[PDB]
Design a protein around this nucleic acid. Structure first.
Ligand SMILES: [K+]
Ligand SMILES: [K+]
Ligand SMILES: [K+]
Ligand SMILES: [K+]
Ligand SMILES: [K+]
Ligand SMILES: [K+]
Ligand SMILES: [K+]
Ligand SMILES: [K+]
Ligand SMILES: [K+]
Ligand SMILES: [K+]
Ligand SMILES: [K+]
Ligand SMILES: [K+]
Ligand SMILES: [K+]
Ligand SMILES: [K+]
Ligand SMILES: [K+]
Ligand SMILES: [Mg+2]
Ligand SMILES: [Mg+2]
Ligand SMILES: [Mg+2]
Ligand SMILES: [Mg+2]
Ligand SMILES: [Mg+2]
Ligand SMILES: [Mg+2]
Ligand SMILES: [Mg+2]
Ligand SMILES: [Mg+2]
Ligand SMILES: [Mg+2]
Ligand SMILES: [Mg+2]
Ligand SMILES: [Mg+2]
Ligand SMILES: [Mg+2]
Ligand SMILES: [Mg+2]
Ligand SMILES: [Mg+2]
Ligand SMILES: [Mg+2]
Ligand SMILES: [Mg+2]
Ligand SMILES: [Mg+2]
Ligand SMILES: [Mg+2]
Ligand SMILES: [Mg+2]
Ligand SMILES: [Mg+2]
Ligand SMILES: [Mg+2]
Ligand SMILES: [Mg+2]
Ligand SMILES: [Mg+2]
Ligand SMILES: [Mg+2]
Ligand SMILES: [Mg+2]
Ligand SMILES: [Mg+2]
Ligand SMILES: [Mg+2]
Ligand SMILES: [Mg+2]
Ligand SMILES: [Mg+2]
Ligand SMILES: [Mg+2]
Ligand SMILES: [Mg+2]
Ligand SMILES: [Mg+2]
Ligand SMILES: [Mg+2]
Ligand SMILES: [Mg+2]
Ligand SMILES: [Mg+2]
Ligand SMILES: [Mg+2]
Ligand SMILES: [Mg+2]
Ligand SMILES: [Mg+2]
Ligand SMILES: [Mg+2]
Ligand SMILES: [Mg+2]
Ligand SMILES: [Mg+2]
Ligand SMILES: [Mg+2]
Ligand SMILES: [Mg+2]
Ligand SMILES: [Mg+2]
Ligand SMILES: [Mg+2]
Ligand SMILES: [Mg+2]
Ligand SMILES: [Mg+2]
Ligand SMILES: [Mg+2]
Ligand SMILES: [Mg+2]
Ligand SMILES: [Mg+2]
Ligand SMILES: [Mg+2]
Ligand SMILES: [Mg+2]
Ligand SMILES: [Mg+2]
Ligand SMILES: [Mg+2]
Ligand SMILES: [Mg+2]
Ligand SMILES: [Mg+2]
Ligand SMILES: [Mg+2]
Ligand SMILES: [Mg+2]
Ligand SMILES: [Mg+2]
Ligand SMILES: [Mg+2]
Ligand SMILES: [Mg+2]
Ligand SMILES: [Mg+2]
Ligand SMILES: [Mg+2]
Ligand SMILES: [Mg+2]
Ligand SMILES: [Mg+2]
Ligand SMILES: [Mg+2]
Ligand SMILES: [Mg+2]
Ligand SMILES: [Mg+2]
Ligand SMILES: [Mg+2]
Ligand SMILES: [Mg+2]
Ligand SMILES: [Mg+2]
Ligand SMILES: [Mg+2]
Ligand SMILES: [Mg+2]
Ligand SMILES: [Mg+2]
Ligand SMILES: [Mg+2]
Ligand SMILES: [Mg+2]
Ligand SMILES: [Mg+2]
Ligand SMILES: [Mg+2]
Ligand SMILES: [Mg+2]
Ligand SMILES: [Mg+2]
Ligand SMILES: [Mg+2]
Ligand SMILES: [Mg+2]
Ligand SMILES: [Mg+2]
Ligand SMILES: [Mg+2]
Ligand SMILES: [Mg+2]
Ligand SMILES: [Mg+2]
Ligand SMILES: [Mg+2]
Ligand SMILES: [Mg+2]
Ligand SMILES: [Mg+2]
Ligand SMILES: [Mg+2]
Ligand SMILES: [Mg+2]
Ligand SMILES: [Mg+2]
Ligand SMILES: [Mg+2]
Ligand SMILES: [Mg+2]
Ligand SMILES: [Mg+2]
Lengths: 124, 138
RNA sequence: GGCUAAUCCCCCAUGUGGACCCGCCCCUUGGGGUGUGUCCAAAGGGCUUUGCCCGCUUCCGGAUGGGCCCGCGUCCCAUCAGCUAGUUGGUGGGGUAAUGGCCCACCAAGGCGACGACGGGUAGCCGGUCUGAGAGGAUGGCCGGCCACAGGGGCACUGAGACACGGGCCCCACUCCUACGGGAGGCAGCAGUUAGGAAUCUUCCGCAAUGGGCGCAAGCCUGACGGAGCGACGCCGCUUGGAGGAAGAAGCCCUUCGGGGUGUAAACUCCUGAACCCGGGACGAAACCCCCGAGGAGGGGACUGACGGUACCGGGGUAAUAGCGCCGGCCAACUCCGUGCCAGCAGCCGCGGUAAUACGGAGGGCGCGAGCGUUACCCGGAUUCACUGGGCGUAAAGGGCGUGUAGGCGGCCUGGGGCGUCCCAUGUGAAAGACCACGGCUCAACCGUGGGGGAGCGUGGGAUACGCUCAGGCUAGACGGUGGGAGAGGGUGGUGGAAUUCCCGGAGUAGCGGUGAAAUGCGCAGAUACCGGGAGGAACGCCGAUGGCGAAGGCAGCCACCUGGUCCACCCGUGACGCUGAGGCGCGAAAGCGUGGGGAGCAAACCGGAUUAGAUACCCGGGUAGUCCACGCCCUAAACGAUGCGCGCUAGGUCUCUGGGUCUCCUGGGGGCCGAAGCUAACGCGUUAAGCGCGCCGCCUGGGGAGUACGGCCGCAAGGC
RNA sequence: UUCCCGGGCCUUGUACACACCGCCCGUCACGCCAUGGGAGCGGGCUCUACCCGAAGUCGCCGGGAGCCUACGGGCAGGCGCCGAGGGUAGGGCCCGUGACUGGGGCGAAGUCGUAACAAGGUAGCUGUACCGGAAGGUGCGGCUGGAUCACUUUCU
């Protein structure tokens, strides 16, 4: 474009939309579960994966994945959630942190405990 | 009409150099003549002269080239590789003494215009004067 | 209701002076000087008391701090376009330290606005911080500067100073007391509590230091501050040992069963000695004060330490926390077993359905370390909003075309000015921070000192090449004169031939029509075919094309009239009068709409016949709107050369339209083709550029959703932007 | 050597590359989300007109209805302008809910068909008009992004 055009209209600054509506620049969000379900994946894969309907203190209600080999989640269970999405499972914009509140960490995982929220096992 | 007589000249030079022409004709002016004086002093051209075509004044600029080369495409290396106008109509480029650029690590020159007249980059640097930056040539 | 003191209030005098009206002088907005008239001062107290100290009154000036005015800069939405009513300005008043429409009367109708007003959304701004090569982008916590607020709203007093966080008044909500009439309360001060929340501290020590208020002083107050505590929240510093140690213990893991791996790693040997135990114990602290001197200068003496028995010094002195992510590719580090599209991993490409280096475990390995990953957010890579630093022939993107307002841009020469631009000097650019050098805590972090800088603007001076402006001039751009030329350029009116269809007439017979093949249909009221005559509409065969005209749409028999655009020649005239062009305006194929007319052929819909599994279609027979004309609307498109306009430069060859010429050929303009250089991702473009450059307009930033939803504008409607 | 099957060479078109037993369109039906219109009913803001209007400055009265007085006046008190706020009516905007209802996306793949890519079987695209279970069909006109020298006939 001509210089004068840039003098008049000028360049446009691109915006960015949040993929995590926990609002408040939220690192995490606390919420109470609604249901506990099993969702069928899209075309690329086949499996039974554990998700949950969660109402949030922010006022939002969204689905959240449940990592780990096994878990315990009831209807009214209290759960802290974090950002990040799940690609093979459309509609899930959030992850559930384990080891927090009513969500217990996975049992007997000795490789990576940190992300799955397990304490260091007893010594030899 | 001609929007930028300077740019017209320089572009004609670029063209003529691309086709390895002998000389080229440019409309006569004091500015242009001075710029060509700077061009001749640093040896980017064989030289110039005042000529008359039809009933109108012109300037014959004799180009400059290198020796014949080897392999395919016998065309000799351009003495002037790249030349481009900087200041333009609608955007004027003005630089102070400390704003004066340095072309190709000194391997090339910059043509400016000050109140002391048309100068090179090193000339304007030594005289310590800023002005309009007309174009870059290397 | 009553007594009473004073630096409380008042009255009179004193007029160094100042204040006000009027006059004069100078200066120039209300600055200063001066004259008469008028008006104005006041506080005492303590002494080491008859001399000093503190304080008071008036005026001038300085210093400090601040008010008001102005130039410039200051986010997002144009689906917010008109906004303003004391609003804009003036006269006269009120108010204030002072201008102001701050406030009030009267008069006028002005003021703001695509250079983004008003409206909506959002946000304390800055010194700086983070990132980045740079430009820039984002951010405004801590420290510092300014602003605003003090439960929500509003108002004044006091006073130098407030529209006043721990002052006052009222209204509103809430809490508390109430004898129910009424009052009390305002932690966005320190700490602490509650609630919210992913989440942020001790209801601590101290007036020693610094600073602040009062006081002659002693001194008092000070959650300002100086300190400590809690929190790996961040940065920095340090320890968990150092050395000697077998081809190499065990255990474990691979294994070609030979061996290899963990690995000098450990045991062990020796040495050092974080932690802890004692001893000594700091800088920060010398002033205010007292003495001499003079209550000055100078000299001398004395008191005072929250941190804190802490920093540190000296002596003794134990081998004494390691964890976390990852190991398919990006990306550095591999094997065994388990699992079998299950369980699950994931940032992207993806892994897993029997032997997975991707899941789970194990061995081993890599990265980092008192930390390591995850999520969220910012810059980056990203030249992906491109000033540096991009694009629009086919990937996203040329506006349908023209006219032309604002705006942007400016041919050659001479001169003035010196707004832009450039230079010197000066003022500002606070401190901290950032950069450099030295130094203080054993170093670093941190701190100190000093040095170095800096864009931007103000002021004074200087330069005049370019830009600008004024003065004058030139003629290559452009316009015009004269003389020629072509063309389906456009409007009005008239007119001609061929053919289709219908009517009339003659002649004439058994079918014509139509398909892949048939049938519907027409025909004994006599068709098809032939001839003659008439009617009427619509389109113009050969010429005619690879052609021409127009700005685009588009334009085709011929005559006349009205009229636009354009090419060439003669160098004749004017003298830069130019290019572009947001908005506006006009034009704008076909379809469609309104009114009226006209209607041969054609033909959506539709009435039918075939074909087919079905045929709401392709084939066939009919047939309305429409097609046409008049006027008024509708603004769309593959409105395409998928290439905005104007100018300059850059090999040619070939075909053609048209104009001129010394007419084999040269030249000017237009339309095609092959192609130098060059450009292009390729195809391809290539003097008709998409090449080399310039000026200006429009437009693009992944696909789908969707040219949809909603809003606004235009239209009768359909719809369009 | 026209046609049926297999095959070869050259060329042309392609939206095919597990390669025409290919790809691919849409109505309807099933699964899952978000969204528009929207009567009606709540809530909020703003604007105009009228009306009520506390505190407080300012303004007037301040008198044989009050108090102090050096008689000059002052205070109290009263009235009034403005005014926070409140009410009425009207207008507009935002926000919540909302019966009914429009279309959309993704997915699991069912249904009627063959639309589009080879002349995709009537070349396609297109703006517009009308009609049709649907893709679509046809009329007017336009474009080359159209092949080629000149009955019909689905799907995987
Ligand atoms: K006097
Ligand atoms: K004092
Ligand atoms: K002294
Ligand atoms: K040890
Ligand atoms: K496998
Ligand atoms: K593995
Ligand atoms: K693994
Ligand atoms: K990013
Ligand atoms: K277009
Ligand atoms: K033509
Ligand atoms: K090439
Ligand atoms: K329309
Ligand atoms: K052969
Ligand atoms: K193609
Ligand atoms: K009285
Ligand atoms: Mg799978
Ligand atoms: Mg993420
Ligand atoms: Mg009394
Ligand atoms: Mg006197
Ligand atoms: Mg006097
Ligand atoms: Mg007196
Ligand atoms: Mg006002
Ligand atoms: Mg006045
Ligand atoms: Mg005044
Ligand atoms: Mg805010
Ligand atoms: Mg703020
Ligand atoms: Mg960058
Ligand atoms: Mg940097
Ligand atoms: Mg804070
Ligand atoms: Mg509060
Ligand atoms: Mg005071
Ligand atoms: Mg204040
Ligand atoms: Mg106060
Ligand atoms: Mg308080
Ligand atoms: Mg909580
Ligand atoms: Mg103190
Ligand atoms: Mg002090
Ligand atoms: Mg071993
Ligand atoms: Mg060792
Ligand atoms: Mg020792
Ligand atoms: Mg020892
Ligand atoms: Mg003495
Ligand atoms: Mg002394
Ligand atoms: Mg590797
Ligand atoms: Mg399993
Ligand atoms: Mg993992
Ligand atoms: Mg396996
Ligand atoms: Mg991985
Ligand atoms: Mg960038
Ligand atoms: Mg650019
Ligand atoms: Mg690009
Ligand atoms: Mg395109
Ligand atoms: Mg165009
Ligand atoms: Mg124009
Ligand atoms: Mg103009
Ligand atoms: Mg010029
Ligand atoms: Mg100009
Ligand atoms: Mg100047
Ligand atoms: Mg300076
Ligand atoms: Mg500084
Ligand atoms: Mg040092
Ligand atoms: Mg410094
Ligand atoms: Mg100056
Ligand atoms: Mg001069
Ligand atoms: Mg002139
Ligand atoms: Mg003529
Ligand atoms: Mg004509
Ligand atoms: Mg008829
Ligand atoms: Mg007869
Ligand atoms: Mg019959
Ligand atoms: Mg008969
Ligand atoms: Mg007949
Ligand atoms: Mg033309
Ligand atoms: Mg055309
Ligand atoms: Mg002449
Ligand atoms: Mg003349
Ligand atoms: Mg039209
Ligand atoms: Mg029409
Ligand atoms: Mg009509
Ligand atoms: Mg009609
Ligand atoms: Mg039938
Ligand atoms: Mg038909
Ligand atoms: Mg017919
Ligand atoms: Mg020619
Ligand atoms: Mg030509
Ligand atoms: Mg040619
Ligand atoms: Mg070519
Ligand atoms: Mg080439
Ligand atoms: Mg190629
Ligand atoms: Mg667009
Ligand atoms: Mg998108
Ligand atoms: Mg999008
Ligand atoms: Mg539309
Ligand atoms: Mg064959
Ligand atoms: Mg052969
Ligand atoms: Mg081939
Ligand atoms: Mg087939
Ligand atoms: Mg009233
Ligand atoms: Mg009142
Ligand atoms: Mg009163
Ligand atoms: Mg709703
Ligand atoms: Mg079709
Ligand atoms: Mg079709
Ligand atoms: Mg087909
Ligand atoms: Mg057909
Ligand atoms: Mg077809
Ligand atoms: Mg087609
Ligand atoms: Mg159509
Ligand atoms: Mg039909
Ligand atoms: Mg057609």
């Amino acid at each position: 474009p001509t210089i004068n055009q840039l003098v008049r209209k000028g360049r446009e600054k691109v915006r960015k939309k949040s993929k995590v509506p926990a609002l408040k620049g939220a690192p995490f969000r606390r919420g109470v579960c609604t249901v506990v379900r099993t969702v069928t994946p899209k075309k690329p894969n086949s499996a039974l994966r554990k998700v949950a309907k969660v109402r949030l203190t922010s006022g939002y209600e969204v689905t959240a994945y449940i990592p780990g080999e096994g878990h315990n989640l009831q209807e009214h269970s209290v759960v802290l959630i974090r950002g990040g999405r799940v690609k093979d499972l459309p509609g899930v914009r959030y992850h559930i942190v384990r080891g927090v509140y009513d969500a217990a960490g996975v049992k007997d995982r000795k490789k990576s405990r940190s992300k799955y929220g397990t304490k260091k096992p007893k010594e030899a | 009409m001609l929007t930028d007589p300077i740019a017209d000249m320089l572009t004609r030079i670029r063209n003529a150099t691309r086709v390895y022409k002998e000389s080229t004709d440019v409309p006569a002016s004091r500015f242009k003549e001075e710029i060509l004086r700077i061009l001749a002093r640093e040896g980017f051209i064989k030289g110039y002269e005042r000529v008359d075509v039809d009933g109108k004044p012109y300037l014959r600029v004799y180009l400059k080239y290198g020796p014949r080369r080897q392999g395919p495409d016998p065309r000799p290396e351009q003495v002037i590789h790249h030349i481009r106008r900087i200041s333009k109509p609608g955007r004027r480029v003005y630089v102070g003494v400390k704003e004066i650029p340095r072309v190709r690590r000194g391997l090339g020159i910059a043509i400016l215009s000050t109140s002391k007249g048309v100068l090179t980059d090193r000339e304007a640097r030594k005289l310590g004067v800023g002005g309009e930056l007309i174009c870059e040539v290397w």
